[PDB]
Amino acid sequence: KDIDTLISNNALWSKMLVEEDPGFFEKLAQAQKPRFLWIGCSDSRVPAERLTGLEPGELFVHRNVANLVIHTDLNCLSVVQYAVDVLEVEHIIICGHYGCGGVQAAVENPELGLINNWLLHIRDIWFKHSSLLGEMPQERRLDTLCELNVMEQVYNLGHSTIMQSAWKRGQKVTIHGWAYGIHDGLLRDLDVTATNRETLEQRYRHGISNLKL
Amino acid sequence: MKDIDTLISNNALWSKMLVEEDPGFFEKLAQAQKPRFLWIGCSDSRVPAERLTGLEPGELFVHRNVANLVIHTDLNCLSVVQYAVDVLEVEHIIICGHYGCGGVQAAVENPELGLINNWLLHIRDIWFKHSSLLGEMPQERRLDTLCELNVMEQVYNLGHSTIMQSAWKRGQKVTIHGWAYGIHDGLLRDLDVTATNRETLEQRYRHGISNLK
Amino acid sequence: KDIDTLISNNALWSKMLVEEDPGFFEKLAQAQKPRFLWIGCSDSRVPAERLTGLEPGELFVHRNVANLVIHTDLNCLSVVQYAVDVLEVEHIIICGHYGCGGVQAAVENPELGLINNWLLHIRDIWFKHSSLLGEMPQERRLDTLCELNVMEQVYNLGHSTIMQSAWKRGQKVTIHGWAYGIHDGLLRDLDVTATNRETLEQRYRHGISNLKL
Amino acid sequence: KDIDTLISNNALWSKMLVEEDPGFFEKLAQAQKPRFLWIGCSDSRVPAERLTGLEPGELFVHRNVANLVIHTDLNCLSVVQYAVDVLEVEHIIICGHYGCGGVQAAVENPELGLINNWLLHIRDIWFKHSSLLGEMPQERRLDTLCELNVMEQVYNLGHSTIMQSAWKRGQKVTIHGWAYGIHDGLLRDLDVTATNRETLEQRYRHGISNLKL
Ligand SMILES: [Zn+2]
Ligand SMILES: [Zn+2]
Ligand SMILES: [Zn+2]
Ligand SMILES: [Zn+2]
Secondary structure: HHHHHHHHHHHHHHHHHHHHHHHHHHHHOOOOOOEEEEEEEOOOOOOHHHHHHHOOOEEEEEEOOOOOOOOOOHHHHHHHHHHHHHHHHOEEEEEEOOOEEEEEEHHOOOOOOOOHHHHHHHHHHHHHHHHHHHHHOOOHHHHHHHHHHHHHHHHHHHHHHHHHHHHHHHOOOOEEEEEOOOOOOOOOOOOEEEHHHHHHHHHHHHHHHHHHO | OOOOHHHHHHHHHHHHHHHOOOOOHHHHHOOOOOOOOOEEOOOOOOOOOOHOOOOOOOEEEEEEEOOOOOOOOOHHHHHHHHHHHHHHHOOOEEEEEEOOOOHHHHHOOOOOOOOHHHHHHHHHHHHHOHHHHHHHHHHHHHHHHHHHHHHHHHHHHHHHHHHHHHHHHHHOEEEEEEEEOOOOOOOEEEEOOEEEHHOOOOOOOHHHHHHHO | OHHHHHHHHHHHHHHHHHHHHOOOOHHHHOOOOOOOEEEEOOOOOOOOHHHHHOOOEEEEEEEEOOOOOOOHHHHHHHHHHHHHHHHHOOOEEEEEEOOHHHHHHHHOOOOOOOOOHHHHHHHHHHHHHHHHHHHOOOOHEEEEEEEHHHHHHHHHHHOHHHHHHHHHHHOEEEEEEEEOOOOOEEEEEOOEEEEEEEHHHHHHHHHHHHHOO | OOOHHHHHHHHHHHHHHHHHHHOOOHHHOOOOOOEEEEEEOOOOOHHHHHHHHHOOEEEEEEEEEOOOOOOOOOOHHHHHHHHHHHOOOOEEEEEEOOOOOHHHHHHHOOOOOOHHHHHHHHHHHHOHHHHHHHOOHHHHHHHHHHHHHHHHHHHHHHHHHHHHHHOOOOOEEEEEEEOOOOOOOOOOOOOOOEHHHHHHHHHHHHHHHHOOO
């Protein structure tokens, strides 16, 4: 595939739609305001639209390596603030994927360059739950950390001032932590769904303790 | 409206159906080698990149922020690019904006939106930098032009970072492209700033500005 | 001078104070809510307290390479927000210094590594005012860019949501741009002092115009 | 407004030295690359030069709220990289101060605005050592967290790619964690002094283990 190859595909796809529904493009124009925010990995092993059946225009999408929500990352925080405060999305979905290249690179700690500093936030989670992962067999640890990371990012997101402000002013926003595998593409709900400050805590604590079993 | 239960249910159906049609599809994902493209696009994601370009899941490293910015000091985007260029060894990086972007329009109309306004100040800087150009055009012909100007500047910024400069200096083949598409037809317009090294990055940028003037 | 020296120097200074001035720690003990924010260079060739004769406790200080105020740097912005909104500072001073290593590295562009990306914000100021620097004598260009850099950061500071919100709610905050030389330690006022949105605009443009002469 | 007060003090202080000690400006004019990097709190209750008796020019200084070293803060990381790779400092000192306003705000968690997101990195420390702080009387927790934060930031600093790359190339760099009180200004060495990755690990664990009793 070269750049020209992708360009030609774009023109064809454009023509095909006009022939079938020349009003489609019109539709998107007036497609309201997205009601969901997708925070996913830059791997994008399966795009969010195929996984969820969501159409172009009802998804606000941000993607970074290993789908992180760092307390001081203005990139992700600007997305969250713009979605929550301006677009007023009602659901924020943090979704990781088993086999993530970033999560595994975090654990094996190879000299990869600038990215290693970003992956240290995941390694912090690795050691934070050093006990929990210890109770599990080695093979099932890299997948569990992937679920552990997603729960942590939600916790973080719920602690940021953007989310805390919305919940205190009564805005209806709900945070969800999901994961899917390339073995079946099936979304697994990690059960950390939060709608206010108190549920964020209880969900996170119960999420971790439930993994102990 | 559409709820979470719909998305979860859509996923289970889509998953089983695929097993029915191509049970090897999920195996392909694995075999799929490292991606070859980095897609830096807006969080609006009015049309997902995979449909616009006909690229299937696994051939795209995807990053999205408000108005697809490449700020010199944003570790988020820079970590993505470095992982793509140095670890994944992508050979094409595509920065793609879209006419009608809410962020670019918010930059120009300057409403009090909160935290996001600071992120958009990088666009207002692009507004005044080419304040002369925009004056020569009719008002209608400005909001689309800034959208194209912003994408060219981000392509410029990307090429000036140490990650790109180091890769080009060590002879690695990476090519940066600046595109835009409209929601009226979905046709990608190549902004003609395609760069393959330090000299081309300047020459094309030099070439770009003058033709738009 | 080594580490052991610094520890020993501290112990002497500690008792000497107890012996000579036991009230020094009494002043430090009281509230001493600061009224000034110092945004300066990490070079710190002359500490801010020595330049201004300010006593310990009345200075909130942030320092980075070449005293930058980037729109998307949560570090600098959090200091300013804590100063303006919590500490209620009435003056913010952005101060550069002639001979700055960062300003010199920005222009000569050596391959220094990660720092080069931070310094790219300065090269933006170098080309933005390429007109001014060309008309001036060669020797006085690096000193002028140092003055240009300080004026731009004051401009950026006034554009942030923190300052715009405070001025819009009537809070008394005043931003100043200064510079000092290593030949005499004399502070030069760059005359871009802003107290509101309107003063920020004219003062900026104003500041630039006399340098053209 | 006391800007005029500060302005005259400079001019006064400037002539005073020029008349009395014209070499003060000669020493500062001498190209003395610093040997120490100071990462301290923006409170700057006692300036670093007064605490250590260090004279102008041998101190590279960075200050943020509660002297944090975040894995993804390019501000602090650009300072560290420039010091270690360009200036080749031989010592980095992370110094907190008991009674720090930021450390206290993290624990009491008042709604202060944007700064609260920065302080969540400290709240991370507070809950990470929930066991240790729990075993101590309430009165001795805010001071302990202050020492805990300094150990963690030294831990974070030693894990960054800048330090890891520098140590692996054989460069001599040493990280130190200190604290001082407003009651006496006496530096207490927290005993986390690291010269390589292995010592950083052992130092950190022993630091936490010693606090247990
Ligand atoms: Zn991934
Ligand atoms: Zn957009
Ligand atoms: Zn400097
Ligand atoms: Zn403090």
